[PDB]
Design a protein around this ligand. Structure first.
Ligand SMILES: Cc1cc2c(cc1C)N(CCc1ccccc1)[C@H]1C(=O)NC(=O)N=C1N2C[C@@H](O)[C@@H](O)[C@H](O)COP(=O)(O)OP(=O)(O)OC[C@H]1O[C@@H](n2cnc3c(N)ncnc32)[C@H](O)[C@@H]1O
Length: 636
């Protein structure tokens, strides 16, 4: 009942977390029973919020809706409610307030960027009773949540998947905005470069070989410490390559031992044939040979020589039998065929899409450190378009579009930030405030000449963490036809590339909209490279692949086409962060720590600051909530 509400909030239902011990020391240092009832009140208020997240849950409605034993200790109920409301576990997202937020607002803060992190932090700080204003360089809100809308056509160019609802705050936000989510059919047929389908047996054989290779690299790192070789951190690509080399030699070694057995039996047979012709000539020359007793003795010798010959002929029979049967049963010739390698490269490209970077750059030890915080349930796509979430989050917020910040000043006296209108950067704006929450993407902070100056310049640990962490890339091309020529029962289908070097080029195709739209991904080393290619020839290559799969007859020229270039986009400089070889999971927490030239005044939020949920939009949401909570807890 209430345990489900605790789980949905990413909390253990029968034990208090560390932040609750920090905010409620009188309980962790007290009796067990009051800890248990604290947990019950927390879970019950969470359940009340989650069962009807459309309207604000007040302390008053909380008190009135709790049941008999707990409704009387009003002060602890209010403590629990205030704790939960401060940290964004209740009254977050877009909800109808019971009383409109107060007129006078104690504290003014500017927020860089209008992404999901920025919008969430803005809404939290607004309903906390503070003055908030956003500066967004782009001409729309959401940032990396980009939905191309034209006529009947809807297509997400950035955020596109909801990675499960079990514990996901995106479940609450989807319920609030009435966004319809549809399951993804996890059936992905593959098609080779010529267009012929990959048979079932080969498909699943290569798939499970890929999985075994990945588990082998996991082992190499987590029980042999194959983490630093030659004073160099090991990538996932290195471990994959060396495990492939190991299995290729297992193949070669079994080949060698088979050849050695066969040649040794061949030598045995040649020498036995020598012995046999020797005995044959002995038998012949004796066959050519009291005289009655001599005849009888000669025959007594000849029969013995003949039984000798025939016993050895029996041994020869079983030995030629053995040679033939080992001529029949050899081991594998190649570990992977050429086509086997191409299919395995498709699976590698799928992993490169999952991490938005080439595995040549992923920390073998830490690339999947977030894995233990994944949500339960099935992955869901959005049909209304993911922009329905940022735009819905933006109503009622003081958002200044087309204002790119170029300088951020933070001193103990206050904070001044210099922004500039984008459409002609001669006009200049300047904003004073008490705090600044930066939600700039890591790609913007990484830029070769700093697109935003910081005065005083950022600390050593901050800039070092910015440089160590990885910020990957992943692109989409969407094709809008008039007719649907593909199988409407499959959401995913793959195209296997010819070369390993270009295995992530148009390797996956999505039919996740029942409107006639097809989405093709570009991941890995191709992502940052095919951005240098005009849209027309990329859609030409897509049409070539689709012609090879379906025939030149059944595919018309598309009626609308869109291409993403996220690394080129000056407001993104890539897709999402990844754990680079030199980096670790602690670098996200370093990105999360605020700066103080004294009290902290420059705070950081965004997808690259949430250790347990990076690379995802629910991570940006939760990071915005956390930073708003700490800002309001300091300034109020
Ligand atoms: C590019 C791409 C991003 C995502 C995805 C795909 C792409 C192509 N996937 C889809 C595939 C997938 C599947 C499964 C797992 C992972 C991925 C999405 C998905 O299936 N799930 C998912 O969950 N997150 C997906 N993701 C990740 C992101 O979607 C997510 O990580 C959030 O988008 C992070 O958002 P946030 O941290 O807020 O950063 P933004 O970039 O959103 O906000 C910053 C704002 O700053 C403005 N700005 C810039 N420079 C400025 C300046 N100088 N002055 C003022 N403003 C400035 C920008 O204009 C922007 O608006």
């Amino acid at each position: 009942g209430v345990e489900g509400a605790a789980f949905q909030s990413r909390l253990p239902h029968d034990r208090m977390t560390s932040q609750e011990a920090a905010c409620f020391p009188d309980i962790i240092s007290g009796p067990q029973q009051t800890q248990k009832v604290f947990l019950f009140i927390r879970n019950r208020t969470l359940q009340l919020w989650l069962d009807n997240p459309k309207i604000q849950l007040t302390f008053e409605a909380t008190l009135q809706q709790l049941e008999a034993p707990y409704n009387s200790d009003t002060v602890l109920v209010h403590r629990v409610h205030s704790y939960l409301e401060r940290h964004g576990l209740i009254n977050f997202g877009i909800y109808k307030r019971i009383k409109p937020l107060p007129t006078k607002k104690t504290g003014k803060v500017i927020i860089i960027g209008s992404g999901v992190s920025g919008l969430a932090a803005a809404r939290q700080l607004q309903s906390f009773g503070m003055d908030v204003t956003l500066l967004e360089a782009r001409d729309r809100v959401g940032g990396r949540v980009a939905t191309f809308r034209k006529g009947n056509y809807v297509a997400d160019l950035g955020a596109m998947v909801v990675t499960g609802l079990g514990g996901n705050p995106m479940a609450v936000v989807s319920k609030q905005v009435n966004m319809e989510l549809a399951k993804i059919k996890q059936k992905c047929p593959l098609y080779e470069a010529n267009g012929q389908a990959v048979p079932k047996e080969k498909d699943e054989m290569v798939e499970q070989e890929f999985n075994r290779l990945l588990e082998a690299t996991s082992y190499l790192s987590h029980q042999l410490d194959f983490n630093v070789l030659n004073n160099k951190p090991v990538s996932l690509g290195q471990a994959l390559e060396v495990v492939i080399q190991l299995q290729e030699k297992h193949v070669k070694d079994e080949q060698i031992e088979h050849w050695k057995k066969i040649v040794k039996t061949q030598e045995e047979l040649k020498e036995l044939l020598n012995k046999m012709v020797n005995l044959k000539e002995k038998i012949k020359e004796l066959h050519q040979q009291t005289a009655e007793f001599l005849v009888k003795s000669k025959h007594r010798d000849l029969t013995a020589l003949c039984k000798e010959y025939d016993e050895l002929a029996e041994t020869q029979g079983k030995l030629e039998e053995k040679l033939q049967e080992l001529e029949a049963n050899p081991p594998s010739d190649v570990y992977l065929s050429s086509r086997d390698r191409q299919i395995l490269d498709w699976h590698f490209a799928n992993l490169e899409f999952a991490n938005a970077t080439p595995l040549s750059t992923l920390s073998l030890k830490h690339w999947d450190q977030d894995d233990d915080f994944e949500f339960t349930g099935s992955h869901l796509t959005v049909r209304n378009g993911y922009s329905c979430v940022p735009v819905a989050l933006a109503e009622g917020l003081d958002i200044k579009l087309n204002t790119a910040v170029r300088q951020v000043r933070y001193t103990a006296s206050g904070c001044e930030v210099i922004a500039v209108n984008t459409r002609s950067t001669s006009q200049t704006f300047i904003y004073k405030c008490d705090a600044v929450l930066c939600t700039l993407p890591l790609g913007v902070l990484k830029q070769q000449p700093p697109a935003v100056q910081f005065v005083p310049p950022l600390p050593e640990w901050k800039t070092s963490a910015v440089q160590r962490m990885g910020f990957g890339n992943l692109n989409k091309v969407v094709l809008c036809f008039d007719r649907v020529f593909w199988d409407p029962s499959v959401n995913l289908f793959g195209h296997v590339g010819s070369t390993t070097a270009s295995r992530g080029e148009l390797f996956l195709f999505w039919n996740l909209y029942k409107a006639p739209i097809l989405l093709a991904l570009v991941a890995g080393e191709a992502a940052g490279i095919m951005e240098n290619i005009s849209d027309d020839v990329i859609v030409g290559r897509c049409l070539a692949i689709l012609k090879g799969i379906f025939g030149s007859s059944a595919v018309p020229q598309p009626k609308e086409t869109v291409v993403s270039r996220w690394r080129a986009d000056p407001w993104a400089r890539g897709s999402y962060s990844y754990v680079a070889a030199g980096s670790s999971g602690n670098d996200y927490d370093l990105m999360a720590q605020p700066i103080t030239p004294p009290i902290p005044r420059l705070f950081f939020a965004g997808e690259h600051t949430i250790r347990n949920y990076p690379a995802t939009v629910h991570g940006a949401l939760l990071s915005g909530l956390r930073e708003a909570g700490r800002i309001a807890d300091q300034f109020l």
